[PDB]
Amino acid sequence: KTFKQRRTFEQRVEDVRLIREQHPTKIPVIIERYKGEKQLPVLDKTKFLVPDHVNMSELIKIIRRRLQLNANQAFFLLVNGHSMVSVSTPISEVYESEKDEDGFLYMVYASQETF
Ligand SMILES: NC(=S)Nc1ccccc1OC(F)(F)F
Ligand SMILES: [Cl-]
């Protein structure tokens, strides 16, 4: 069901290596709906190439636009299992400290801050 489940550590590593080769300026991001989530829809896909200059605040806006949410629907985004300490950090910086050992940056979203 979840991404890590569907692809071997070997396969995830090689896809990150291909994104480096073909999209050197993009951060490889996995974005998944919390398996408990009731309100928010599921995304059209799982794997995103994010321009390395966008900050977490702009990534949240991007995903809210992708889900086509409205002003008073809630949205929380966990990175590498935990709350973001700041939304102003460039995703290049966030990647370097929060990346998985496979090379992806893992994110999960929910309507509840209590995931
Ligand atoms: N659409 C995605 S997933 N990423 C993206 C972002 C900005 C420009 C182009 C993009 O696609 C590309 F990475 F495939 F090039
Ligand atoms: Cl590129």
Instruction: Quickly list DSSP for 64-115.
Output: HHHTT--TTS--EEEETTB--S-SSSBHHHHHHHH--TTS-EEEEEESSS--
Question: How many domains are there within the chain?
Answer: 1
Closest C-alpha residue for ligand 1 atom 8: 51
Separation between Cα atoms, residue 40 and residue 54, nearest integer Å? 23
Is there an atom of ligand 1 within 6 Å of 51 CB?
yes
Which structural domain range is residue 38 located in? 1-115
CB 75 within 8 A of CB 69: yes
Is the distance from the beta carbon of residue 26 to the nearest atom of ligand 1 less than 6 Å?
yes
Residues with Cβ within 8 Å of 55's Cβ and at least 6 positions away in sequence, in order, are 87, 88, 89, 90, 91
Q: Which of 26, 52, 107 to mutate to test the pocket of ligand 1 (most atoms within 8 A of CB)?
A: 26
